[PDB]
Amino acid sequence: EVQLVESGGGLVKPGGSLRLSCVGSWMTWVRQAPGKGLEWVGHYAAPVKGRFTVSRDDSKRTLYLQMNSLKIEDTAVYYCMTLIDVWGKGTTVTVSSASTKGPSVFPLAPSSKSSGGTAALGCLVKDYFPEPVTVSWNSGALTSGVHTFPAVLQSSGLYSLSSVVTVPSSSLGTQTYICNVNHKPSNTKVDKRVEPK
Amino acid sequence: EIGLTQSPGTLSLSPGDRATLSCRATQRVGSDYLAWYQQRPGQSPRLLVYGTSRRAAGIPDRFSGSGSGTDFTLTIDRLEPEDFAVYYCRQYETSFSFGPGTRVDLKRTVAAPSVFIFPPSDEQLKSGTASVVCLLNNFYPREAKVQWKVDNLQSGNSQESVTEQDSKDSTYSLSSTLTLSKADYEKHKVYACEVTHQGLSSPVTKSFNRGE
């Protein structure tokens, strides 16, 4: 089947530059900022004209997007597109001046009975960079009720996230709850016991 | 040169309903230069129709393209559970921009949020920052409102995030976290979270006093 693979996406400082490539087996580049819609970059767009330059090699089967003098707003997932359309899997480009940091995990202790089988508790995955982070509960045993929210980018440039779970209020005396936070970019694994306060 | 708008922002329908999405342009677009894309959460976009009305390969018959000039519509004749996604329209004549998107979610019985409030942990207070978290759990529709009261005081600096529509229950969950310094936090007593929602006849408030 007609497929496309992308590479070259990584972490870059705001002033820096990066090049991402797409090999096939006309071409279009589009990006998607976190939680926003598809934005056409070039195939130039007004925010990227002048700084971005699309090149193409018909010999080595590749399409290049040369991103020079990046900005924070350039942080997105860039896609290849070229009747049967085919799209690459995407590679994320993150532009920030913050350095890689492991999250600080804080308990969201169960309180606020709101009772009748439902109690809420969770963990606060705070001040980490970059994305993504993985949160599981009781080493993967707890899967019903867990909501791991999409991260928000704080003003400091570090992300923050909350992962909550609803459990029978009868069980929080008996059952113990630990959340497993895994931040692969920083090679950090944290287990935090959440107990009532 | 040309801007695009889509209506509505979110579309709440049930499986077996007929969906009609709209793409409107600021200036006229030729009928060979308007396409429609579909994107499910966590996947790459997919071409549905191109040239206003022509379908792409392997696309079911429910998807119908229509429109001309400055108004275009995408029709999904009978919705299937896999058809609940985000749909973008794209022009490619003078301007090549995408539209804002239209979210199509499963219409579900109205569900009021389960509100929970979490005080800052003593471990966090050892760092010099206090972040109190309000949780709105398993509600529908997606539209909800959260307001913060550090004293019976209205705030202007907090952050929120909302989950995607759950694959099984078809509900949403929202978390609003208020970030204060430890100096600010220790000064005030009663911390309240006010929640407004279509499933609530009157606003729900959950609060705690710092001493507890």
Number of domains in chain A: 2
Which one of A62, A97, A132 terminates a domain? A97
What residues are paired with A162 via a beta bridge?
Answer: A124
Same domain assignment for residues A74 and A18: yes
**Residue-number span of the structural domain to which A181 is assigned:** 98-197
CATH code for the domain in which residue A78 is found: 2.60.40.10
Cα separation, B100 vs B111, whole angstroms: 27
Task: Tell me how far CA of residue A168 lies from CA of A97, A107, A116, A197, B183, in angstroms.
Answer: 43, 18, 8, 17, 36
| Residue A46: φ, ψ to 5° | -60, -45
Which one of A97, A118, A149 terminates a domain? A97
Q: Do the Cβ atoms of A195 and A109 come closer than 8 Å?
A: yes
* Residue owning tokens 């107990």: A195
Same domain assignment for residues B79 and B141: no
Size of chain A, expressed as the number of residues it contains: 197
Cα separation, A17 vs A33, whole angstroms: 18
Same domain assignment for residues A93 and A174: no
Is B119 near chain A, with CB under 8 Å? yes
Same domain assignment for residues B125 and B85: no
Cα separation, B128 vs B180, whole angstroms: 9
Cα separation, A54 vs A29, whole angstroms: 9
B171 burial type by CB count under 10 A (0-12 exposed, 13-18 middle, 19+ buried): buried
Of A26, A77, A85, which to mutate for an interface test with B (greatest number of B Cβ within 10 Å)?
A: A85
* Strand blocks (E) in B40-126: 46-50, 54-55, 63-76, 86-91, 102-106, 114-118
* Strand blocks (E) in chain A: 4-7, 11-12, 18-24, 28-32, 38-42, 52-57, 62-67, 76-81, 91-95, 104-108, 119-128, 134-137, 147-148, 152-153, 159-167, 177-183, 188-194
Sheet architecture: strand order including A4-7: A4-7, A18-24, A62-67, A52-57
Same domain assignment for residues A194 and A149: yes
Same domain assignment for residues A41 and A78: yes
In the DSSP assignment, the letter for residue A24 is E
B209 burial type by CB count under 10 A (0-12 exposed, 13-18 middle, 19+ buried): exposed
What residues are paired with A149 via a beta bridge?
Answer: none
Cα separation, A133 vs A139, whole angstroms: 15
Same domain assignment for residues A63 and A114: no
Same domain assignment for residues B117 and B147: yes
Neighbours of B46 (CB within 10 A): 17
Same domain assignment for residues A4 and A78: yes
A51 burial type by CB count under 10 A (0-12 exposed, 13-18 middle, 19+ buried): middle
Which one of B93, B108, B123 terminates a domain? B108
Residue A163: partners with Cβ closer than 8 Å, 6 or more residues away: A122, A123, A125, A135, A137, A146, A147, A148, A149, A179
Residue A18: partners with Cβ closer than 8 Å, 6 or more residues away: A8, A9, A10, A12, A67, A70, A93
Neighbours of A174 (CB within 10 A): 7
Cα separation, A111 vs A120, whole angstroms: 8
Same domain assignment for residues B6 and B84: yes
Q: Write out chain B residues lying below 8 Å of A147, CB-based.
A: 137, 163, 173
**Residue-number span of the structural domain to which B74 is assigned:** 1-108
Residue A122's Cβ-side half-sphere holds a number of Cα atoms within 13 Å equal to 28
Phi-psi region of A64 (alpha: psi -120 to 50; beta: other; left: phi over 0): beta
Number of domains in chain B: 2
Q: Write out chain B residues lying below 8 Å of A111, CB-based.
A: 117-119, 208
Phi-psi region of B65 (alpha: psi -120 to 50; beta: other; left: phi over 0): beta
Residue of chain A whose alpha carbon sits nearest to that of B131: A124
Cα separation, A163 vs A179, whole angstroms: 9
Give this entry's resolution in angstroms. 3.1
Beta-carbon separation of A152 and B159 below 8 A: yes
Q: Do the Cβ atoms of A79 and A20 come closer than 8 Å?
A: no
Residue A46: partners with Cβ closer than 8 Å, 6 or more residues away: none
Same domain assignment for residues B26 and B6: yes
Phi-psi region of B101 (alpha: psi -120 to 50; beta: other; left: phi over 0): left
Which one of B108, B125, B147 terminates a domain? B108
Gap between the terminal Cα atoms of chain B = 59
Q: Do the Cβ atoms of B120 and B152 come closer than 8 Å?
A: no
Sign of the dihedral through C-alpha B102, B105, B109, B114: negative
Same domain assignment for residues B99 and B132: no
Neighbours of B39 (CB within 10 A): 18
Cα separation, A47 vs A45, whole angstroms: 6
Which two tokens mark B130?
A: 């206090």
CATH code for the domain in which residue B14 is found: 2.60.40.10
Same domain assignment for residues A163 and A105: yes
